[PDB]
Amino acid sequence: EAIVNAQPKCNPNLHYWTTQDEGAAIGLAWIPYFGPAAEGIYIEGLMHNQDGLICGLRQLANETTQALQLFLRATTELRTFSILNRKAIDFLLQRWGGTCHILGPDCCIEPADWTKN
């Protein structure tokens, strides 16, 4: 469905921290011996509520909790790192798990430029 924000409040701005995707370091900063300590490996950013995304995210995370918790109850893995990779595999299985019927609704094959030939 669509995400409906049912929280008492919503901070519309998002001051976020994360880690850089690669980001070839200046000179020798990539060597662990010379690199930054654990506290200084973060990049920061600011995101506003365009398209109401921020507030939606806050609801989305809330709504995720239940399902996530149930998953974590069923797993014997102490630390779970594989949710996103499993979701990517499921994305591929949804489209290409079976034979693709061209022009079908569950087949993502476009014979448009082949039609004009």
């Binding site: 469905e1 919503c10 901070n11 976020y16 989305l60 918790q69 109850r73 979701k87």
Partner: protein, 239 residues
């Protein structure tokens, strides 16, 4: 199924597995992101008395940990050193590789005692304790954390200043818990929910500059006469 967030028609939505939309393109794992969002942003009370009441001890439930890649700067964080009346630790040591939450404006360090009738401390509302890119279902001893939740989504194709506010607690985890804001090792201020972090900081500063600290060897406790907005928008008296 764990919900997955996707941007459709200029709005975030939860994608339904019972619906294949060929328009969405997932060209690499870089498009998939896990996100941690603090309860602070939903308007929950962040004062120590209110925050602690959302946590409780329980046994028989193995702890669980899940990682997340990006997080939100927090106004309030918490760091617990709780022991039983006999001195045994109430919380487990942080497992290897679990560090405190990386961005906290105020770290509420609470030290005290409680019954701790449970092997682990869990969130009574099902939320998570957010650490450095790891979210746990339980509280680790002496490790800074924020209350938060995790979301998963598909992307389309000043400085940092931290201040530590110290508290003393008795009866931790019960309905008769008592809290003291610590000015120094012998000066304390009775605490309630009304006290905001900046208010506590200014109380401490004026107590120091006005000499209201304990100039004796004993413990001095201050109760304050009175004297709903979100942050992003030997006893004696003080009146």
């Amino acid at each position: 199924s764990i919900p997955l967030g996707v941007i459709h028609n200029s709005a975030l939505q939860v994608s339904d597995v019972d619906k294949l939309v060929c328009r969405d393109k997932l060209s690499s794992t870089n498009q998939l992101r896990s996100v941690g969002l603090n309860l602070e942003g939903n308007g929950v009370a962040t004062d120590v008395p209110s925050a602690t009441k959302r946590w409780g001890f329980r046994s028989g439930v193995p702890p669980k940990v899940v990682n997340y890649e990006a997080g939100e700067w927090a106004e309030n964080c918490y760091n617990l050193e709780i022991k039983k009346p006999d001195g045994s630790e109430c919380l487990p040591a942080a497992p290897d590789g679990i560090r405190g939450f990386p961005r906290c404006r105020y770290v509420h360090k609470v030290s005290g005692t409680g019954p701790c009738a449970g092997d682990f401390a869990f969130h009574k509302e099902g939320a998570f304790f957010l650490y450095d890119r790891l979210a746990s279902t339980v509280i680790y001893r002496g490790t800074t954390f924020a209350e938060g939740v995790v979301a998963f989504l598909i992307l389309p194709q000043s400085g940092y200043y931290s201040t530590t506010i110290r508290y003393q607690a008795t009866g931790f985890g019960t309905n008769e818990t008592e809290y003291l804001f610590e000015v120094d090792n012998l000066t304390y201020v009775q605490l309630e929910s009304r006290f905001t972090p900046q208010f506590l900081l200014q109380l401490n500063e004026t107590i120091y500059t006005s000499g209201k600290r304990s100039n004796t060897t004993g413990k001095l406790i201050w109760k304050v006469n009175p004297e709903e907005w979100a942050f992003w928008e030997x006893x004696x008296x003080x009146x």
